[PDB]
Write an enzyme that holds these catalytic residues in place. Structure first.
Site, PDB file in Angstrom:
ATOM      1  N   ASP A  15       0.327  -4.567  17.142  1.00 39.64           N
ATOM      2  CA  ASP A  15      -1.045  -4.544  17.709  1.00 39.64           C
ATOM      3  C   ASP A  15      -1.454  -5.822  18.451  1.00 39.64           C
ATOM      4  O   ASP A  15      -2.654  -6.043  18.697  1.00 39.64           O
ATOM      5  CB  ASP A  15      -2.103  -4.278  16.622  1.00 39.64           C
ATOM      6  CG  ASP A  15      -1.917  -5.160  15.404  1.00 39.64           C
ATOM      7  OD1 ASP A  15      -1.328  -6.260  15.539  1.00 39.64           O
ATOM      8  OD2 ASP A  15      -2.351  -4.755  14.319  1.00 39.64           O
ATOM      9  N   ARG A  29      -5.216  -9.075  20.756  1.00 43.36           N
ATOM     10  CA  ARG A  29      -5.234  -8.279  19.583  1.00 43.36           C
ATOM     11  C   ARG A  29      -6.103  -7.073  19.924  1.00 43.36           C
ATOM     12  O   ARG A  29      -7.242  -7.188  20.398  1.00 43.36           O
ATOM     13  CB  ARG A  29      -5.775  -9.110  18.424  1.00 43.36           C
ATOM     14  CG  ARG A  29      -6.009  -8.330  17.133  1.00 43.36           C
ATOM     15  CD  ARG A  29      -4.692  -7.729  16.569  1.00 43.36           C
ATOM     16  NE  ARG A  29      -4.837  -7.350  15.145  1.00 43.36           N
ATOM     17  CZ  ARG A  29      -5.312  -6.170  14.714  1.00 43.36           C
ATOM     18  NH1 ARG A  29      -5.748  -5.238  15.577  1.00 43.36           N
ATOM     19  NH2 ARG A  29      -5.419  -5.894  13.409  1.00 43.36           N
ATOM     20  N   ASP A  34      -5.884  -1.316  12.710  1.00 42.76           N
ATOM     21  CA  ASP A  34      -4.974  -2.027  11.840  1.00 42.76           C
ATOM     22  C   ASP A  34      -3.683  -1.235  11.816  1.00 42.76           C
ATOM     23  O   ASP A  34      -3.710  -0.023  11.923  1.00 42.76           O
ATOM     24  CB  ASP A  34      -5.589  -2.195  10.445  1.00 42.76           C
ATOM     25  CG  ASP A  34      -4.712  -3.055   9.500  1.00 42.76           C
ATOM     26  OD1 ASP A  34      -4.000  -3.938   9.919  1.00 42.76           O
ATOM     27  OD2 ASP A  34      -4.776  -2.794   8.362  1.00 42.76           O
ATOM     28  N   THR A  35      -2.553  -1.929  11.769  1.00 48.30           N
ATOM     29  CA  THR A  35      -1.203  -1.331  11.875  1.00 48.30           C
ATOM     30  C   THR A  35      -0.400  -1.809  10.676  1.00 48.30           C
ATOM     31  O   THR A  35      -0.800  -2.756  10.021  1.00 48.30           O
ATOM     32  CB  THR A  35      -0.454  -1.792  13.153  1.00 48.30           C
ATOM     33  OG1 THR A  35      -0.503  -3.233  13.292  1.00 48.30           O
ATOM     34  CG2 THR A  35      -1.085  -1.130  14.407  1.00 48.30           C
ATOM     35  N   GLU A  37       2.801  -3.817   9.080  1.00 51.23           N
ATOM     36  CA  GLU A  37       3.601  -4.994   9.536  1.00 51.23           C
ATOM     37  C   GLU A  37       5.050  -4.543   9.772  1.00 51.23           C
ATOM     38  O   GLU A  37       5.453  -3.470   9.303  1.00 51.23           O
ATOM     39  CB  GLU A  37       3.593  -6.113   8.504  1.00 51.23           C
ATOM     40  CG  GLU A  37       2.215  -6.639   8.174  1.00 51.23           C
ATOM     41  CD  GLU A  37       1.453  -7.045   9.421  1.00 51.23           C
ATOM     42  OE1 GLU A  37       2.102  -7.639  10.287  1.00 51.23           O
ATOM     43  OE2 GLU A  37       0.236  -6.689   9.569  1.00 51.23           O
ATOM     44  N   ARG A  75      -6.817 -15.272  19.776  1.00 45.61           N
ATOM     45  CA  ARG A  75      -6.409 -14.067  20.364  1.00 45.61           C
ATOM     46  C   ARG A  75      -7.576 -13.420  21.059  1.00 45.61           C
ATOM     47  O   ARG A  75      -8.657 -13.325  20.509  1.00 45.61           O
ATOM     48  CB  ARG A  75      -5.835 -13.115  19.290  1.00 45.61           C
ATOM     49  CG  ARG A  75      -4.596 -13.658  18.645  1.00 45.61           C
ATOM     50  CD  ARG A  75      -4.034 -12.769  17.562  1.00 45.61           C
ATOM     51  NE  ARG A  75      -5.084 -12.382  16.603  1.00 45.61           N
ATOM     52  CZ  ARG A  75      -4.853 -11.572  15.584  1.00 45.61           C
ATOM     53  NH1 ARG A  75      -3.620 -11.190  15.320  1.00 45.61           N
ATOM     54  NH2 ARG A  75      -5.834 -11.186  14.820  1.00 45.61           N
TER      55      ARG A  75
HETATM   56  C1  LIG Z   1      -8.949  -6.995  15.045  1.00 41.23           C
HETATM   57  C2  LIG Z   1      -9.760  -8.202  14.675  1.00 41.23           C
HETATM   58  C3  LIG Z   1      -9.200  -9.100  13.786  1.00 41.23           C
HETATM   59  N1  LIG Z   1      -9.850 -10.223  13.439  1.00 41.23           N
HETATM   60  C4  LIG Z   1      -9.262 -11.160  12.450  1.00 41.23           C
HETATM   61  C5  LIG Z   1      -9.706 -10.687  11.071  1.00 41.23           C
HETATM   62  C6  LIG Z   1      -8.507 -10.936  10.188  1.00 41.23           C
HETATM   63  O1  LIG Z   1      -8.609 -12.252   9.551  1.00 41.23           O
HETATM   64  P1  LIG Z   1      -7.502 -12.781   8.484  1.00 41.23           P
HETATM   65  O2  LIG Z   1      -6.228 -13.238   9.137  1.00 41.23           O
HETATM   66  O3  LIG Z   1      -8.299 -13.917   7.902  1.00 41.23           O
HETATM   67  O4  LIG Z   1      -7.282 -11.617   7.569  1.00 41.23           O
HETATM   68  C7  LIG Z   1      -7.333 -10.926  11.148  1.00 41.23           C
HETATM   69  C8  LIG Z   1      -6.542  -9.626  11.119  1.00 41.23           C
HETATM   70  O5  LIG Z   1      -5.649  -9.624  12.206  1.00 41.23           O
HETATM   71  P2  LIG Z   1      -4.164  -9.014  12.036  1.00 41.23           P
HETATM   72  O6  LIG Z   1      -4.315  -7.600  11.529  1.00 41.23           O
HETATM   73  O7  LIG Z   1      -3.530  -9.151  13.412  1.00 41.23           O
HETATM   74  O8  LIG Z   1      -3.597  -9.948  11.011  1.00 41.23           O
HETATM   75  O9  LIG Z   1      -7.847 -11.105  12.447  1.00 41.23           O
HETATM   76  C9  LIG Z   1     -11.125 -10.486  13.961  1.00 41.23           C
HETATM   77  O10 LIG Z   1     -11.736 -11.512  13.576  1.00 41.23           O
HETATM   78  N2  LIG Z   1     -11.710  -9.635  14.842  1.00 41.23           N
HETATM   79  C10 LIG Z   1     -11.095  -8.500  15.210  1.00 41.23           C
HETATM   80  O11 LIG Z   1     -11.694  -7.724  15.974  1.00 41.23           O
HETATM   81 CA   LIG Z   2       0.109  -7.607  11.841  1.00 44.65          CA
END
Ligand SMILES: Cc1cn([C@H]2C[C@H](OP(=O)(O)O)[C@@H](COP(=O)(O)O)O2)c(=O)[nH]c1=O
Ligand SMILES: [Ca+2]
Length: 129
Positions: A15, A29, A34-35, A37, A75
């Protein structure tokens, strides 16, 4: 919301994708998903599907929502389109992502992706199987 140009630099994983946007390399991103890993079930297939979609596109577009455009990791947060088809929606529709990370003001396409998830679930596709 508005679609804006970008070009693929590299597929990354399930993702995220590295795009050139306004001339600069950025990791994006996908909003509202959510996907799994890479080393979890359906991770490789999510990864492959995203990669295929972005690599095969003749035109990538980036569509920001009304809220935050970059996350805490730097991102970019967008809806990404490959020849007009939304990658975020496509992953969900195929049961390779779930609707997730729905924050207020960055949720214009929520109900569109929820509908997609509902159909993937009904079809028992992939993560729903
Ligand atoms: C998709 C998305 C993720 N995020 C942050 C929340 C999550 O924080 P944490 O890393 O603290 O869990 C993380 C999840 O991304 P990934 O699913 O790529 O890891 O990215 C945002 O802040 N806004 C968004 O719209
Ligand atoms: Ca991931």
């Amino acid at each position: 919301l508005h679609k804006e140009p970008a070009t693929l630099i590299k597929a990354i994983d399930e993702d995220t994708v590295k795009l050139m946007y306004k001339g600069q390399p950025m990791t994006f991103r996908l909003l509202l998903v959510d996907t799994p890993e890479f080393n979890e079930k359906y991770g490789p297939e999510a990864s492959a599907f995203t990669k295929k979609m972005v690599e095969n596109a003749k035109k990538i577009e980036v569509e920001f929502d009304k809220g935050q455009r970059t996350d805490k990791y730097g991102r970019g947060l967008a809806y990404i389109y490959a020849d007009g088809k939304m990658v975020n929606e496509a992953l969900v529709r195929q049961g390779l992502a779930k609707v997730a990370y729905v924050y207020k003001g960055n949720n214009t396409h929520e109900q569109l992706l929820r509908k997609a998830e509902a159909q993937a679930k009904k079809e028992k596709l992939n993560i729903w199987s």
